[model samples]
Target: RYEKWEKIKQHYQHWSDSLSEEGRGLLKKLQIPIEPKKDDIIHSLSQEEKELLKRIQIDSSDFLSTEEKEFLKKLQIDILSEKEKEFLKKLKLDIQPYDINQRLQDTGGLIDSPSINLDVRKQYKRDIQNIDALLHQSIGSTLYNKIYLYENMNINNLTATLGADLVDSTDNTKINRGIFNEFKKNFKYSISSNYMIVDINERPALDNERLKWRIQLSPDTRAGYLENGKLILQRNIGLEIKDVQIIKQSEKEYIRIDAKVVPKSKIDTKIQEAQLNINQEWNKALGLPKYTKLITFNVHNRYASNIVESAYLILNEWKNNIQSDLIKKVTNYLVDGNGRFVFTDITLPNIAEQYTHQDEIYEQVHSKGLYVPESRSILLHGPSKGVELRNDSEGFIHEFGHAVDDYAGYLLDKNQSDLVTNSKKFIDIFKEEGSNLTSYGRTNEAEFFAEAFRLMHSTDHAERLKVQKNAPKTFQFINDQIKFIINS
Candidate 1:
């Protein structure tokens, strides 16, 4: 069998937590003896139905033996053809997740990031806010159980994680759809294909309450359709241990039968610095972190030249040492000395007022680098030239991080395009150098190259990300992409 020890570990824990409330209800509802069937029929299903069953990873033949089928008239699920029956048996050997949308009595995921501490505690306020929101929406007869899964592999022994919720949410599926969507929109998480699932067991009571759905899936092909996955469940699946306190009820020894849960760890310092990166630190220091500068905006900073130099050493030199591996791959297209790169047009702005205002002293990058000198300009905002952002050693690493990337020649895709196309008075160099790579001769190379290089490299240029509380996938994706790009 193909073994995904990690997946098996996660799935077992997640669904076990899932079974607490829902499983009990289904067990109570599908109670046997009162509603026991003497046997099951394998061949009653038509050819199409049989094919559909196989596509869902279940063998109809497993549901019955021929004699059992003949003995129980109650067995009415359509059976497969001989060819179909043969195909279904192959699924027994594979290991895969129980992908899905069931009202998991719980939900699963890495609470914040990288640090996953099983022995840690939860903040009651955030937990209450979350639980309160869920309670308003928990609804109907559903009681929930959750299994939080953490990565068992890492230096800190944590990074990637996911969770599963188990519950009889036949009625709550609609509510879940909304909750899940909101999660997708607000949170920086990508829903795995089996990201959510619904387990439709043969609940005698749910025969009326739950609706049976059959979406075609095949282990043979397109299995990836499971986005990053969800599931439809069957009979062999059994109770997931809910309360670990009672795990050893059957045995007095330390041996426990109840499922164990992993918890999300606390805020990581490295990650906090990473998510803030360079440009963001500037904004945070300025108190205008949004994409747009707000009205009534006033900004100031005390320029600490020593701190600026230290911040440069920490962030810039660190990036430079790895630039061959991290930044150069992108900027080298224009040659490492590309004119647009590291070539700062340090501006001492023409402040009209007697005492310079916030606009004069700020260290800001141009969104659109249309003109050669103007394109490369970075003005220090407020009195301190952004040195204020670097007060804490960690905080300084952030603001300088921005200057380093720009100096190294990087621009966001939007700014890159804008720099080339916008024809204002300042970008007179472009008048001599045409836009396309083919037309621009070698003489205009550095400027052309820097723009090109920065376009490829700059804007989001951190060699290694320090993911903070807000975005995991964003940090992970960037970190992953950097690794992939550099290695390639």
Candidate 2:
């Protein structure tokens, strides 16, 4: 028995030497001596000492004994602020409590200050960052990132203020209103809020192009208003769009938005209007008041003087012949408010090169009369050997479809349009009547819509009847879309 006692004492010395300062002090409180003398006999220990020895064991570096670890757990959720506790609870983070140091013991509670355990704070920050990274990956450059601005707002309270449902991510209208209420709570000075879910699909082809997720504001609604009417184009709480790119790193996707708020253009919009309308106003002065209404035409070339006359004649024919409501929608977005219909003899290098080089050219007179959405002008191929500007209303109407579709948000979304065309309703007709209208009509969906648009309006009555019979669904869809633009 004495030899067995020596063996146990030898192992006991190893355990006692490993006890941390805190753990050793706690053991002494229980009248337990962890560091017995080298000559001490373990078998000679009193019954009370042996009982206390059975209660302890080393668990980790932070706590020297299992009893010390249990003591820390007793400091419950009471030490944590309701805010921090709730933040963790909502995220469903199942983490154990952080250890409190001896210095905090005098406070008669555990240290719950965020700074007390920076490791945990850093961990929480990382969790949110991971969530945001996943969000941007899923949403691309849309409004997914903008919602992070109010992750901690008292959404229940703000929803009460908005008198609407908080943006639980579905009803965008109510969510947008709730977003405004949240902004209202953070500011002292007067301000108004608005938002836009802008689409960039119709924009010129370029790298890193994505849709706009905007949060706009002004001093008041009047300042937000553009055109001194219902239109509002100004932005105070705005971020200028520079680039939208999808980046892939480590098999994880991310959306990179490169944008900044720059100073507004100093060139007053009133002056911009004067410059853009110079030709139309001049045409009105030329004793042709009709030029002041639908569109104004301009021409400058070294060709015959009749070239200018020819362009205007074609434009006037296009104006009267196309659907009246169709013209109204185009006029509202593209023609009114300092709008002009410019026709020039100058060969647009861009279009000229495209005409000569592009294999995707579909129309009979593809680049002869090009409508530029940016400049709001029609650049007719210079009166050269091959350019045909006279009696080309068909060409004008075909391109008009593009001009109208560019601003057709009042009609439907681009994705919705794609769904319609790809839908079984239109696809079945397309399969049966593969070459119903024209070869160009089947180039792609957008082209089909544009070609059908021109044919329905400008074709002979018999031709129109044949097209309607062949593709009733396509015909009705085009008519509904165009009709909405007219009434809108």
The most accurate candidate by TM-score is: 2
In model 2, the worst 10-residue window by lDDT is: 221-230
Q: lDDT (CA) for every model shown? A: 0.26, 0.39
The total number of steric clashes, by the backbone 3 Å criterion, in model 2 comes to 0
Model 1: residue 181 alpha-carbon error in angstroms: 29
Q: How do the residues 287-311 of candidate 1 rate in per-residue lDDT, one tens digit apiece? A: 4434322111111111112122233
Q: Quote each prediction's TM-score.
A: 0.19, 0.33
Overall local distance difference test of candidate 2: 0.39
lDDT of 1: 0.26
Supply every candidate's count of residue pairs whose N, Cα or C atoms clash at under 3 angstroms: 59, 0
Candidate No. with top lDDT: 2
Q: Candidate 2 on 1-488: residue-level lDDT in tens?
A: 33423432342444446556754443233222232222233354456544433333323221122343343233221121333323322212112232221112111111222222356545434432332232111111332233211001122211122223233346422234444433333221111111111221212212222112222222221111111111222221223333434443344323233433222222123223433465364445333344454343222211212334445455676767786557655755555433445443333332332233332212212234555554444445423321222235666676676666555642456454323455455567566555666765765665566677777766467766776987777788777767667666
